[model samples]
Target: MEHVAFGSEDIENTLAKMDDGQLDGLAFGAIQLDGDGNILQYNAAEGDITGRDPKQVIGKNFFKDVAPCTDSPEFYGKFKEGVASGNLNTMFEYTFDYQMTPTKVKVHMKKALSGDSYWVFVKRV
Candidate 1:
């Protein structure tokens, strides 16, 4: 059983060290992206929650193609700001209301310390 809670303080760092399998093992959804919002890794949990096949989402645009609902000042804006500042660690409540049922979730966006990659951690609320 995994003990890493979605809101764990070290989640960002913990994610940096995880492989695909380890990430997929997470109970919540985990998405890895580039600074430009390009999808790098879409774990199983994410696919399960979004009803999107991970294979189709990887290498896609997160804000534009994958999840357009987040292409707003509240979500995408904050992510871009983090990309600029290199200190992206923020959490907030959001609703995924496009192309699917409006599911309320807690969103945690973080920039990994070891690379240019960013992480979006989601937990249904």
Candidate 2:
């Protein structure tokens, strides 16, 4: 297994600091999704961004609640194809109506462990 430079201690400290909301109004969510698209982690800041609690979203599928727009068969099909082919990075801008207003978001996605698990990092613009 290739070792990442971020050790356990560093990850612990980083996670602790992520709880502090130090990045002004900018918040981040580290979402881990399974092959079937189940949301494993919907971090606190992510919950705050969507005005939904983590408990409400943690076990649910992301495409169901978080970004239903991606639930289309075509979109998800391409996404899965990219993952299977070792496409490690993807970025795009999208607009969604949330909180009764159109909000813009930039999405970044990465594949891990040959796409058995995928990580998505989202930022609000």
Candidate 3:
């Protein structure tokens, strides 16, 4: 499978262009997570979609605030298994209760550099 490479410079450029108006209505979060599921970067688009601030989220656990539905051991186990097996990509649809409503989202997970971290791209359906 083909993967898009997003370097630090690319991420910075993208963030610079993602304004508040463009983020407010977006239904997804562009989350960067460590191997332990710790959130590294939580974008404004994600904060708006989930009604949470980046300051409150970045450095917190991804499964704790962003996607609590995936907090189950089963889910984490599978995620770890995928990483251990070198499965660099995975996709699935899930429902998250965001702002009092059950929102449907498409999640794409990719292993970053040496599988030490993961990048999740979410899109609302």
Candidate 4:
């Protein structure tokens, strides 16, 4: 609703229309998840930023396996809350240090109003 990097346009609709090539070209990481946190979409920037290949992460549980560090209440809890409620939009700072060095980053979550799709935007803070 407010100002965002994806622009002030209809991001929800745009995200739905964006192809893999468009998602990969983004300057920051963008990940699309299912209601259960399964990785449904992952971009090149996301793979590069997380140091994991998209092939290995796709079809994986994002919170439980792919990025277990987010299993905490801050990440997973919020994700669950939003998905269940069918509306979610939040931004916060986070650190990922489960299997790698500590890395501080910004996290943005946006969920579809009519579906279980979740769009996550990540960038180094």
Error of 1 at 32 (Å): 0.6
Clashing pairs in 2: none
Best-to-worst lDDT order: 1, 4, 3, 2
Worst 10-residue lDDT window, candidate 2: 1-10
**For model 1, how does the per-residue alpha-carbon lDDT over 50-105 read when each residue is reduced to its tens digit?**
78998888899999887999999999999999999888889999999888888999
Model 3, 1-125: lDDT tens digits are: 11223233233234434444443333456776777789877667666556777778778887765667787654566677766776546667777774557877777676655346666767676
2-57: candidate 2 lDDT, tens digit per residue: 12222222322233343223322234545667767788656565565566676677
- lDDT for each residue of candidate 4 in 59-125, tens digit (9 for 90 to 100): 9999888898899899999999998888888889999886777889888888853377998888887
Give the TM-score (vs. native) of candidate 2.
0.65
Model 3 collision count:
0
Which of the numbered candidates is closest to the native, going by highest lDDT? 1
- Candidate 1 TM-score over all chains jointly: 0.94
Best by TM-score: 1
